[PDB]
């Protein structure tokens, strides 16, 4: 009976742990995916600043 308790507990335990790192790894990846997208759009902003800026350096 002790072995059965230990085995129901380890299964509950490893399932809790396997799920928790999955949800963390998914949190990390999705954030590192949206941030990369934003940062391409912000490099986009500087570039457009350099285009408006270069044009003023033209008169």
């Amino acid at each position: 009976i002790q072995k059965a308790i230990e085995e129901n507990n380890n299964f509950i335990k490893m399932a809790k742990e396997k799920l928790a790192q999955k949800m963390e790894s998914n949190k990390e990846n999705r954030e590192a995916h949206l941030a990369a997208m934003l940062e391409r759009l912000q490099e986009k902003d500087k570039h457009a600043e350099e285009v408006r800026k270069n044009k003023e350096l033209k008169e």
Binding site: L34, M37, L38, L41, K44, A48, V51, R52, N54, K55
Partner: protein
């Protein structure tokens, strides 16, 4: 609900956008005052998609109409259903773009863009659950081209997890003699490849050839080209605007049609320009494609088809099977079941039954090569390039748009030549 926020920009975007709203306000039974005068609760079950319900029960388009010269918007508010639009949603400038992309994207559009975004926000935050945005615009002009794609970049910053669709009108020498158009189209594509989920390639090259040669309309007005586009626009949104077996939002439909993020450029079609067999035969025929491309020169990654009107849905199922079997070489074999069909029992105005076609085909590369040919002819001469470096742009930015668009074409070719083994 699941609401869409609509945007029209430039000459072309506003012209095709206005007609778009006349057809679908018609279908949902709402007069240019905004009062429902239909006969079907069906006409309202998805009315939230494109309308706000106002005090005194008046449905108002969730439309934002934009330009850099006030003339073209004067026509809308004076044209039919002009009094239905939200008056504050008119966002025009005075100094136009002059069929120049840099003016629309970097300098003149950059000055007006923030006040457009304010109108976007006001409409967006009142939605229960916004699906995303749809833009009508041309890639040949200056406002719809450069400011339309600037406004896309800005919206994807503030709504990075919303879907962005566009009906982009591609330029052809058969409609507009304007000469710098291949310059504009190529710089826009270098934007849409990155920041849109779903782009319908409406090609004037095509639209001209269909009015000329099928409807037999020599000297075709823009009102004739748009009559086709408005029928295409109404068709691809029919599933969204009415209740059927399919309950799919913008994201779900993009998921099943876009196997690769860059390859989201669709060639649409319409039929009749009947019996279910010939209706289906016509719509896979290359002469009904709104993009000047032959599908039998490439392979279909995915296909959506929308039939309308009362018809045997068993016969539609049999005929779609028939077409796939007889044309199997033109559908990639490594995407099983890549042809999906929808049936709306409400037919359009005038037609007892019609069919709308959406095709994600590698043959669209034909389009992107016509533009790239006209672009590189001009570019190595540097013709009219001073109009762009005048606004501050760099020769290098041109070359990337060229290479990034040569990259896209090869990628279409890669998957067209891929096999299951």
């Amino acid at each position: 609900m699941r609401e869409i926020v609509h945007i029209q920009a430039g000459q072309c975007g506003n012209q095709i956008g206005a007609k778009f709203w006349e057809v679908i306000s018609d279908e949902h039974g709402i007069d240019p005052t905004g009062s429902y005068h239909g006969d079907s609760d069906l006409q309202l079950e998805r009315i939230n998609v494109y309308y706000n319900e106002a005090a005194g029960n008046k449905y108002v388009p969730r439309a934002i109409l934009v330009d850099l010269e006030p003339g073209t918007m004067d026509s809308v508010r004076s044209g039919p259903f002009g009094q239905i639009f939200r008056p504050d949603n008119f966002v025009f400038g005075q100094s136009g773009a002059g069929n120049n992309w840099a003016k629309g994207h970097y300098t003149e559009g950059a000055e007006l863009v923030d006040s457009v975004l304010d109108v976007v926000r006001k409409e967006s935050e009142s939605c229960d659950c916004l699906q995303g945005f749809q833009l009508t615009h041309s890639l040949g002009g200056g406002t719809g081209s450069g400011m339309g794609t600037l406004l896309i970049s800005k919206i994807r910053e503030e709504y990075p997890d919303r879907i962005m669709n566009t009906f982009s009108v591609v330029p052809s020498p058969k409609v507009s003699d304007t000469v710098v158009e291949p310059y504009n189209a190529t710089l826009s594509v270098h934007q849409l490849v990155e920041n849109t989920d779903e782009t319908y390639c409406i090609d004037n090259e095509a639209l001209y050839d269909i009015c000329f040669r099928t409807l037999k309309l020599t000297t075709p007005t823009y009102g004739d080209l748009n009559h086709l586009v408005s029928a295409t626009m109404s068709g691809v949104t029919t599933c969204l605007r009415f209740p059927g077996q399919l309950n799919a939002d913008l994201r779900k439909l993009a998921v099943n049609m876009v196997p690769f993020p860059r390859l989201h450029f669709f060639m649409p079609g319409f039929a009749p320009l009947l019996t279910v067999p010939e209706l289906t035969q016509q719509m896979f025929d290359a002469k009904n494609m709104m993009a000047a491309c032959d599908p039998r020169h490439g392979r279909y990654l995915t296909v959506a088809a929308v039939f309308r009107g009362r018809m045997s849905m068993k016969e539609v199922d049999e005929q779609m099977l028939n077409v796939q079997n007889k044309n199997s070489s033109y559908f990639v074999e490594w995407i099983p079941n890549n042809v999906k069909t929808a049936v709306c029992d409400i037919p359009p105005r005038g037609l007892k039954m019609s069919a709308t076609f959406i095709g994600n085909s590698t043959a669209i590369q034909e389009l992107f090569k016509r533009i790239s040919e006209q672009f590189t002819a001009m570019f190595r001469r540097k013709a009219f390039l001073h109009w762009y470096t005048g606004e501050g742009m760099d020769e290098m930015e041109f070359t990337e748009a060229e290479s990034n668009m040569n990259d896209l074409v090869s990628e279409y070719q890669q998957y067209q030549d891929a096999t299951a083994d």
